[model samples]
Target: KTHVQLSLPVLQVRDVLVRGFGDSVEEVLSEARQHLKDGTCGLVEVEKGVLPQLEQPYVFIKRSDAAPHGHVMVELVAELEGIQYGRSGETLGVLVPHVGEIPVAYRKVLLRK
Candidate 1:
């Protein structure tokens, strides 16, 4: 079957930034999204080290198909076996390939909080 997922209000990583992971979180992520606009094959990895409380790390890629609105197409690069991770209710730390780790949670929770 075909698969797809959508996330709204693609806010800058700085706004929904997480704490306790270190400083590079925001800087690194700020550039990750640019890959989409500039047409670079960039990928985002949700590292488990920062949020070890979660099940496992995640790998996300920008699909050739884009979202309709301000939403970003966050496509997960998961193992064939399957996987699980946190969402809006839970916090997470992101790893932008080669750059560094980023501290962040769901903007729905961060902005509202």
Candidate 2:
């Protein structure tokens, strides 16, 4: 079959913001990087102390569409009744079995298993 493929241009990432880490920003960032690189797992599993709200470690990484403007800010979300919500200290991240993705440009490096 005669086929034609379009070549996609490269989009560079401006910066990275590991949100919801609170005091454990450094730790969360490190974990997130590892998960992103793993490729197999998209959801970054945050530790217990990192985000105290979560009673247990869960996946809570949703791609930030606003990343194009300035930096990549990873917002911590809570999944409730199929809805995503954000709150300071009350909420941390996501649940369920799902794989997430970040821009390949920054995949080279946040949270859980």
Candidate 3:
């Protein structure tokens, strides 16, 4: 047997305040974009037509732990070459195994997000 399928149009939120910590605004925006794109971001239920905390800036950083985080790790994008803390400084720490058993302390890309 088969059943009819149901569908609904996209009901976009008029204002979605992406909240995250960064040295500046750009990094926060970048991270929020990544979170929204990959679908790790959080969502909550609230009354309609009214205001919700999630709709506004979150309690803290509205992000995923598996994404990325930290100052030393944030500015460590691959674009920066031999200037400051972008690529070199990001992975400028140690190279030992299980730095703290968490596996994140030694991660060059994956950070505290």
Candidate 4:
């Protein structure tokens, strides 16, 4: 038998933003529906085999001088067998797991203060 290991960087939780679906949960679901039409944010490894929500996904919008782009590096630990990889050169085959089939946008934010 061979030994295999997989590891992911940990991402910092800078802030949490909550967006109410609406007066009712249905409204929120509707908004999420529209958001999916555009495109959702890419999935980043949060925990092993578990991905946290991204719409109100925890935002780590902070920059540090010690790291490149002033952003902190996130590290995660996962099993090699659990990792999902695309074909050697197939781009379309890439699998993106999302919640509610909604599209989310991910934008890197750099704050200078």
Candidate 5:
């Protein structure tokens, strides 16, 4: 039998607060953090040459209350190694399993009410 070993990134909720959802934000954040740490957020292999040079590690947080929005906040923290590139210096794309890629355009939308 062939075995495939996959590496999944882990995340944690530093804090959580909510007022209008009729649910406890602390409870929700705790559950969300558990989901992230447990590999429920899925995985994606980032491609080379797609992003600019990184001076510092990048951090992203996404959240939504819409039914279709997944209703969870994800935090991604990674050091900037360099532009994503293949061995031949060609641009490479990341592979994301199960979940769709999060768009950068949604950054502002996440903070909007």
Candidate 6:
């Protein structure tokens, strides 16, 4: 059978700005996103499986002093599998993200955030 997933490909990114600061989560995330938008983010990874949302390990950021200021800094986060992650409350799934039918949860995430 065919498979379906939500959101974009898991942007396996290394948030840079978070390194030098006092662990400012939001600021680091912002800087990382700036790089992320410019397409210089680390990369996206794919696992062979799919998410109550069960459990998802987050952050694989690397320290690259030469990489620039907005380097990867995010270390780790928490999540569940095959369910949902954001606050807007919507059922979520997993796998390689596709750009076909935009899912409800993602749409909600984008709209409110």
Which ten-residue region of model 4 has the weakest summed lDDT?
Answer: 86-95
How well does each candidate superpose onto the true structure, as a TM-score? 0.25, 0.25, 0.22, 0.23, 0.22, 0.24
lDDT of 1: 0.29
- Which 10-residue window in model 6 sums to the lowest lDDT? 104-113
- List the global CA lDDT of all models: 0.29, 0.32, 0.26, 0.26, 0.26, 0.26
Per-residue lDDT of candidate 2, residues 42-106 (tens digit)? 22233554434432223355443333333333444443335434432322233222133233333
Candidate 6 scores a C-alpha RMSD against the true structure in Å of 15.9
Measured on C-alpha atoms, candidate 3 has an lDDT of 0.26
> Which residue runs of candidate 2 sit more than 4 Å off their true CA positions?
1-23, 40-60, 66-113
Better of 2 and 5 by TM-score: 2
Candidate 4: where is the Cα deviation over 4 Å? Answer: 1-14, 40-113
* Error at 108, model 5, angstroms: 18
lDDT of 4 by residue, 1-113 (tens): 12111111222222223322233334433443333233431223344433333332122212222333533332211112243221121111111223333223342322221
Model 3 lDDT tens row, 1-113: 12111111111233333322233434534654354344333222123642232222221211122222332222212111122322223122211111112121122223333
Question: Judged by lDDT relative to the true structure, which candidate is superior, 2 or 4?
Answer: 2
Ranked by TM-score, the better of candidates 4 and 6 is 6
Q: Candidate 6, which segments miss by more than 4 Å at Cα?
A: 1-22, 44-113
Off by over 4 Å in 3: 1-21, 43-113
**Candidate 1 per-residue lDDT over residues 25-68, each given as its tens digit:** 34333443443334332222234343342222332342333233
lDDT, candidate 5, 48-109, per-residue tens: 53223211222223322332242232232222344211122211112122233332321111
